[PDB]
């Protein structure tokens, strides 16, 4: 299924995922496609911060959903 990942810069990235995919795996996909290291990634859906070990299905994330990507940089 297709999902949308909305960043803080007004860029939306499209991903192809399965509800059985883990959050850790989604983050890897994002890294693969945009180059953002997973450790800097903070995914938000329905007011919840998504946990690495959970799957998309745990959160009831359906096709064409939009996740919010917030960056957490290490150092400033």
From Swiss-Prot:
Give the subcellular location: Cytoplasm; Nucleus
Q: Where is this site: Essential for function?
A: 68
- Site Interacts with activating enzyme: list residues: 54, 72
Domain Ubiquitin-like positions: 1-76
Q: How is it modified after translation?
A: Phosphorylated at Ser-65 by PINK1 during mitophagy. Phosphorylated ubiquitin specifically binds and activates parkin (PRKN), triggering mitophagy. Phosphorylation does not affect E1-mediated E2 charging of ubiquitin but affects discharging of E2 enzymes to form polyubiquitin chains. It also affects deubiquitination by deubiquitinase enzymes such as USP30. Mono-ADP-ribosylated at the C-terminus by PARP9, a component of the PPAR9-DTX3L complex. ADP-ribosylation requires processing by E1 and E2 enzymes and prevents ubiquitin conjugation to substrates such as histones.
Q: What is the effect of changing residue 72 to K?
A: No effect on ADP-ribosylation
Here the cross-link named Glycyl lysine isopeptide (Gly-Lys) (interchain with K-? in acceptor proteins) sits at 76
Q: Which residues carry this modification: (Microbial infection) ADP-ribosylthreonine?
A: 66
Residues recorded as bearing Phosphoserine in the entry: 65
Q: Which domain of life is it from?
A: Eukaryota
Residues with the ADP-ribosylglycine modification? 76
At what sequence positions does the UniProt record place the cross-link Glycyl lysine isopeptide (Lys-Gly) (interchain with G-Cter in ubiquitin)? 6, 11, 27, 29, 33, 48, 63
Q: What is the effect of changing residue 65 to A?
A: Prevents phosphorylation in case of mitophagy. Impaired translocation of PRKN to mitochondria
Can you list the disulfide-bonded cysteine pairs?
A: none
Write out the function statement from the record. Exists either covalently attached to another protein, or free (unanchored). When covalently bound, it is conjugated to target proteins via an isopeptide bond either as a monomer (monoubiquitin), a polymer linked via different Lys residues of the ubiquitin (polyubiquitin chains) or a linear polymer linked via the initiator Met of the ubiquitin (linear polyubiquitin chains).
- The name on file for this protein is Ubiquitin
Q: Which residues of the full protein are shown?
A: 1 to 76 of 128
